[PDB]
Amino acid sequence: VMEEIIKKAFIESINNIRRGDKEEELKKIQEKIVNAKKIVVATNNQKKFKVIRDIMLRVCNAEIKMLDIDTRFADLTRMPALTKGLIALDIEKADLYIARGRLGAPGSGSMLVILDEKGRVLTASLSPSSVIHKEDIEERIKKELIEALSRIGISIL
Amino acid sequence: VMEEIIKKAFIESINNIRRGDKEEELKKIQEKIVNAKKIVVATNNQKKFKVIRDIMLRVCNAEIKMLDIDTRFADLTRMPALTKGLIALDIEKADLYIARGRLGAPGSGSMLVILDEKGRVLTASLSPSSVIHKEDIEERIKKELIEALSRIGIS
Numbered sequence: 001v002m003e004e005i006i007k008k009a010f011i012e013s014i015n016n017i018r019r020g021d022k023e024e025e026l027k028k029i030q031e032k033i034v035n036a037k038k039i040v041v042a043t044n045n046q047k048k049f050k051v052i053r054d055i056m057l058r059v060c061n062a063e064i065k066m067l068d069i070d071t072r073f074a075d076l077t078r079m080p081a082l083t084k085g086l087i088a089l090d091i092e093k094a095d096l097y098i099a100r101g102r103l104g105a106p107g108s109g110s111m112l113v114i115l116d117e118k119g120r121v122l123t124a125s126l127s128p129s130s131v132i133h134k135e136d137i138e139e140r141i142k143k144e145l146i147e148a149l150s151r152i153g154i155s156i157l
Numbered sequence: 158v159m160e161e162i163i164k165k166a167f168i169e170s171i172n173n174i175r176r177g178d179k180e181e182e183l184k185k186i187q188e189k190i191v192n193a194k195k196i197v198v199a200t201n202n203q204k205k206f207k208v209i210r211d212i213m214l215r216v217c218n219a220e221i222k223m224l225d226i227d228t229r230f231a232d233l234t235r236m237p238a239l240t241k242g243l244i245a246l247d248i249e250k251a252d253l254y255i256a257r258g259r260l261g262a263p264g265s266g267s268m269l270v271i272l273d274e275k276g277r278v279l280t281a282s283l284s285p286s287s288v289i290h291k292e293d294i295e296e297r298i299k300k301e302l303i304e305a306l307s308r309i310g311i312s
C-alpha cells in the first residue's frame with residue numbers, strides 16, 4: 001500500500017498541486033518502522049551495533065542483525081553512508097536497513113540513514129565533523145538515531 | 158586543490174588507515190564556502206531565494222542568483238533535494254549550489270544541501286516532516302542553512 005500512497009503524492013506533484021508531506025505518508029513511515037521485525041545494521045564495529053540495537057528494541061519488536069562484510073568500499077563514493085545502506089540492501093534481506101557513515105566529501109561530518117525494503121530513504125540525521133565535535137561516538141550515534149526517529153514522530157520513550 | 162586532499166583521503170581508505178575527517182579537509186570546505194564568488198539557489202521561489210541570500214551575503218561576498226526554471230520535477234526522484242542541486246549544477250555555473258527539498262520518500266521531512274562546482278556534498282541539514290513541525294518553509298529553511306553552516310564551523 002506504500003506504493004499507493006507514494007503514487008498519490010507523485011500524482012499530486014505531476015498536477016502541480018503538491019504541498020509538502022502528508023500525514024498519511026508520515027504515519028505510513030512510522031508504522032513501517034514500528035512494525036519492522038527484521039533490521040540490518042550496515043557497519044562492522046559492534047559498539048555502533050549495540051547502541052542502535054538497544055535503541056531500536058524500545059521502538060519495535062525486531063530481530064536486529066549486523067553485517068559480516070566491511071563497508072570501507074563506500075568511503076570513496078560521493079555519499080558513503082547511503083552507499084553502505086545500498087550495499088546492505090543488495091546482500092541482505094530485511095525490512096529496515098540502518099547505515100552510518102560520512103555524509104559526502106571528506107570533512108562533511110556524519111550521517112545516519114534508514115532505508116526500507118526497496119531502498120527508499122525513510123529518515124536520517126546528521127552530526128558535525130568529529131574534527132570540531134570532539135565528543136564520544138556512542139553518544140553521538142545515540143543522538144543521531146534518536147533525532148532520526150523523532151523527526152518523523154517516533155518516540156524512543 | 159581539493160582534488161589532492163580528497164585523493165589523499167581516498168588513499169588512506171585504500172590502505173585502510175583512514176580514521177575519519179581531518180582538519181585540512183574541513184578547512185578546505187570552509188575555504189570553499191567563504192571564498193565563493195558565485196552562489197546559485199536552486200529555486201524559482203521568492204521567499205526561499207531572499208531567505209538564503211540574506212545569510213549567504215553576510216557569510217561571503219558573492220553574487221547570489223536564482224533560477225529562471227523551477228525544480229519541482231525533482232519531487233518524483235528518490236532524493237528530491239539532491240536532484241534539485243544537480244539540476245542547478247547542470248544548467249548554470251557557480252562556486253556554490255544551495256538546494257532545498259524533500260529528504261527522501263514522501264513523509265520523510267526536508268533536507269537542505271550545499272554543493273561545490275563538481276556536485277560534491279559539502280554540508281547539509283535536516284528538518285522533521287512539515288506535518289509535524291507545521292512551520293512554513295522560510296523559518297526552517299533559515300534554521301537549516303544556519304545549522305548547515307554552523308555544523309562545519311561557519312558563523
Ligand SMILES: Cc1c(O)nc(CC(=O)O)c(C)c1O
Pocket residue numbers: 018019020021022232257258259260263264265266267268285286287288
Ligand atoms: C514536495 C515536498 C514534499 O512532498 N515534502 C517535503 C518535506 C516536508 O513536507 O516536510 C518537501 C520539502 C517538499 O518540497
Ligand SMILES: Cc1c(O)nc(CC(=O)O)c(C)c1O
Pocket residue numbers: 075100101102103106107108109110128129130131175176177178
Ligand atoms: C571515513 C569517515 C570519514 O572520513 N568521515 C566521517 C565523518 C566524521 O569523521 O565525523 C566518518 C564517519 C567516516 O567514517
